[PDB]
Amino acid sequence: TTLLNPYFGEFGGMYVPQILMPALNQLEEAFVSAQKDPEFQAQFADLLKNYAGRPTALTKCQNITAGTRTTLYLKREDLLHGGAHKTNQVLGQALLAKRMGKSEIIAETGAGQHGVASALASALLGLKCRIYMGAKDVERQSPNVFRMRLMGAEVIPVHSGSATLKDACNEALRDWSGSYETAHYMLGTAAGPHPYPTIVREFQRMIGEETKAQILDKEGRLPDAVIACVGGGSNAIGMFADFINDTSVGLIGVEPGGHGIETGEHGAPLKHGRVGIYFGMKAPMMQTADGQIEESYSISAGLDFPSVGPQHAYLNSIGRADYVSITDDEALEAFKTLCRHEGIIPALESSHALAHALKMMREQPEKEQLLVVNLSGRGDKDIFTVHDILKAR
Amino acid sequence: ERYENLFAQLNDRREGAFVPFVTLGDPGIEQSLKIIDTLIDAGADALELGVPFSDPLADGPTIQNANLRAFAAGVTPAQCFEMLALIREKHPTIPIGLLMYANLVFNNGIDAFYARCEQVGVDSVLVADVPVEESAPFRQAALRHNIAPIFICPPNADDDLLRQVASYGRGYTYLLSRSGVTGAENRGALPLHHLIEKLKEYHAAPALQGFGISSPEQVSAAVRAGAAGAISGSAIVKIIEKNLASPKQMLAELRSFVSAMKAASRA
Ligand SMILES: O=P(O)(O)OCCNS(=O)(=O)c1ccc(OC(F)(F)F)cc1
Ligand SMILES: C=C(/N=C/c1c(COP(=O)(O)O)cnc(C)c1O)C(=O)O
Ligand SMILES: c1ccc2[nH]cnc2c1
Numbered sequence: 001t002t003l004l005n006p007y008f009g010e011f012g013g014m015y016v017p018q019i020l021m022p023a024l025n026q027l028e029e030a031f032v033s034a035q036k037d038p039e040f041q042a043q044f045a046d047l048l049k050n051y052a053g054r055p056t057a058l059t060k061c062q063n064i065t066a067g068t069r070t071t072l073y074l075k076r077e078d079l080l081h082g083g084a085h086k087t088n089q090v091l092g093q094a095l096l097a098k099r100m101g102k103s104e105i106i107a108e109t110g111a112g113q114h115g116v117a118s119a120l121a122s123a124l125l126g127l128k129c130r131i132y133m134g135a136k137d138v139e140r141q142s143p144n145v146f147r148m149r150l151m152g153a154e155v156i157p158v159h160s161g162s163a164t165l166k167d168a169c170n171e172a173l174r175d176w177s178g179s180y181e182t183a184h185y186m187l188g189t190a191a192g193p194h195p196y197p198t199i200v201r202e203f204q205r206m207i208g209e210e211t212k213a214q215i216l217d218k219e220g221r222l223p224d225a226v227i228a229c230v231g232g233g234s235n236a237i238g239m240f241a242d243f244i245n246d247t248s249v250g251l252i253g254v255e256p257g258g259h260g261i262e263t264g265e266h267g268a269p270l271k272h273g274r275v276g277i278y279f280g281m282k283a284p285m286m287q288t289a290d291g292q293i294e295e296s297y298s299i300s301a302g303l304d305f306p307s308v309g310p311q312h313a314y315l316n317s318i319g320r321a322d323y324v325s326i327t328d329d330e331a332l333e334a335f336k337t338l339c340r341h342e343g344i345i346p347a348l349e350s351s352h353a354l355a356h357a358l359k360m361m362r363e364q365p366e367k368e369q370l371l372v373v374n375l376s377g378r379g380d381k382d383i384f385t386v387h388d389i390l391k392a393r
Numbered sequence: 394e395r396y397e398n399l400f401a402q403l404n405d406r407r408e409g410a411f412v413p414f415v416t417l418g419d420p421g422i423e424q425s426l427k428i429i430d431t432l433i434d435a436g437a438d439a440l441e442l443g444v445p446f447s448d449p450l451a452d453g454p455t456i457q458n459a460n461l462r463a464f465a466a467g468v469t470p471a472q473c474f475e476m477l478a479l480i481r482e483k484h485p486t487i488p489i490g491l492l493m494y495a496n497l498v499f500n501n502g503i504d505a506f507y508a509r510c511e512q513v514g515v516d517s518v519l520v521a522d523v524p525v526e527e528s529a530p531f532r533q534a535a536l537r538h539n540i541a542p543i544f545i546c547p548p549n550a551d552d553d554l555l556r557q558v559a560s561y562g563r564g565y566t567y568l569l570s571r572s573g574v575t576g577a578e579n580r581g582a583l584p585l586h587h588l589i590e591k592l593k594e595y596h597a598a599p600a601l602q603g604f605g606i607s608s609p610e611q612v613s614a615a616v617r618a619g620a621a622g623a624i625s626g627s628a629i630v631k632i633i634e635k636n637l638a639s640p641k642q643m644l645a646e647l648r649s650f651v652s653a654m655k656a657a658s659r660a
């Protein structure tokens with residue numbers, strides 16, 4: 001029995017051990033209550049504005065669209081405190097944690113942005129934070145490990161499996177199943193068991209609300225399409241939500257194509273996997289013929305996850321949103337292009353969204369189109385990774 | 394009728410059940426079959442057998458490592474079903490329960506999964522990451538193929554859950570000793586007497602206590618608390634892990650442990 005629908009069509013649900021159901025029911029009730037509470041809403045708005053720096057800019061590209069009929073804006077979530085969109089919903093879930101009388105936070109991270117957001121919010125709001133991070137990601141996103149620890153979070157390398165996000169997710173859930181009485185699990189994407197895909201969307205939806213207001217102010221009309229990378233689904237659903245009922249607006253989500261879909265080394269379950277049950281949810285996932293969960297791959301740690309949030313699987317099934325893939329090399333070229341021609345260093349995750357917008361422009365350069373890319377984070381964490389690769393080439 | 398028959402016999406004998414868990418195919422198919430025959434010979438009343446799964450989220454490191462060993466030996470679900478058929482052909486009356494994760498049941502169709510279980514002579518299936526709230530297609534398919542669907546009564550169970558578990562479950566009721574994941578290093582509580590009592594009030598399938606049961610004292614204590622028996626996994630799996638290079642010593646130490654645990658179930 002739930003207050004809200006745990007499903008999006010066939011996708012979603014609450015596929016956790018029975019022990020965790022009271023915790024999920026408690027969280028759902030506290031969210032429904034908070035959403036109606038003007039004091040909670042005022043506290044959340046105050047933190048977003050005066051601590052995190054919202055609203056974030058909407059920047060028009062000056063140079064990268066030259067000689068085409070594409071106008072491209074970037075929603076500047078890279079300017080948010082902490083350096084990515086992840087900060088928005090963490091502030092909301094931290095306030096829920098306090099509301100429920102929890103004193104500790106568990107989070108998973110891959111890019112380390114969610115871990116950084118969880119640690120900064122825990123430091124501000126007086127929670128004890130522990131973060132699980134796969135050992136491969138501890139290496140390729142190390143600037144974030146340093147930031148988490150300086151902010152007082154305990155960072156726990158996960159060596160199991162692929163040593164990436166899935167493995168961090170597993171360990172966080174295992175921990176929670178023993179610690180729920182005192183710990184809130186601050187899940188950092190629009191995935192996992194209900195009510196997380198719903199909560200994360202509602203605490204990220206200001207991205208699309210601000211974007212709509214900003215584009216109306218600058219252009220006098222809605223975008224032709226909004227484009228966002230999809231690792232678990234939070235930045236994309238946060239950009240998409242306020243546009244879902246504007247049926248003229250295209251919603252394009254971009255999964256990591258890795259070394260190429262045909263190599264099997266990718267992270268694009270929505271379009272290239274099969275429905276299954278894992279991480280608390282019925283969702284598309286990369287899986288073997290026998291139903292074991294595969295390991296994903298992406299150059300970008302934050303997209304390196306072999307499933308995807310259930311609202312995206314639903315929006316795809318009904319045709320409201322379209323999903324595509326971008327390879328590591330396409331993402332790297334979009335990274336380089338934004339740094340050199342707009343003076344913005346984007347996260348490699350966000351570079352996948354930008355790469356697909358550049359393709360939309362370059363393939364059809366006399367098509368008139370007004371596009372927004374969600375620039376979900378900044379690329380400071382990636383500069384060592386990208387440096388190595390460009391020098392070598 | 395294997396669980397019904399077992400509990401009737403145990404009741405007549407004033408005994409609790411002792412039920413070991415192992416992962417099928419750990420540390421290989423042949424050695425696993427010998428392990429299982431050893432467990433039965435040493436006095437196991439029933440078995441709980443895991444099918445290796447890539448991401449076992451209700452399991453601690455000991456059984457994570459059992460799964461990884463089976464995979465290293467190339468064990469697949471199809472091979473597990475061949476093992477199960479061989480086990481039943483040798484042992485016609487022992488109850489056999491599987492520990493599954495949902496994806497492996499859902500993968501090639503829920504109905505098809507339970508039909509395969511029936512064909513090899515499995516008696517029960519516990520899907521660890523399907524709570525009663527999501528159980529409808531799993532419990533329907535189980536009952537259509539004469540398989541008992543096992544449900545969990547956690548220490549945090551409310552009245553609604555007790556009534557659902559009593560109604561929907563068959564074979565035995567899983568009485569969880571504690572929150573957390575499987576592991577011998579985390580000792581659970583004594584069975585909650587109130588939960589055992591409510592389950593009996595609601596005519597639930599007899600309770601077996603599991604998680605953190607690693608010593609004869611804990612088995613005796615479950616029986617005294619009114620549970621029908623106890624399950625031990627990590628403690629048994631630790632004996633496999635320790636003796637990988639010494640397969641004969643492995644079987645000797647498994648027989649010793651199981652016999653001791655079963656002896657403690659005698660009241
Ligand atoms: O002795 P331990 O601590 O290793 O416990 C062994 C338990 N093995 S089992 O198959 O009963 C078993 C039963 C339930 C499980 O998860 C669930 F409760 F969520 F359903 C996991 C394993
Ligand atoms: C894995 C992480 N981040 C993912 C991420 C993503 C992908 O996650 P979502 O699909 O949940 O937006 C997108 N953009 C940025 C800047 C990101 O940091 C993390 O920070 O833990
Ligand atoms: C509202 C409340 C609970 C629900 N469960 C399924 N759909 C729902 C809608």
Ligand SMILES: c1ccc2[nH]cnc2c1
Nearest residue numbers: 108114188189231232305
């Ligand atoms: C996918 C899965 C889990 C995540 N936690 C934070 N970002 C994620 C993306």
Ligand SMILES: [Cl-]
Nearest residue numbers: 639640641642
């Ligand atoms: Cl030997």
Ligand code: NA
Nearest residue numbers: 231305307308
């Ligand atoms: Na993904």
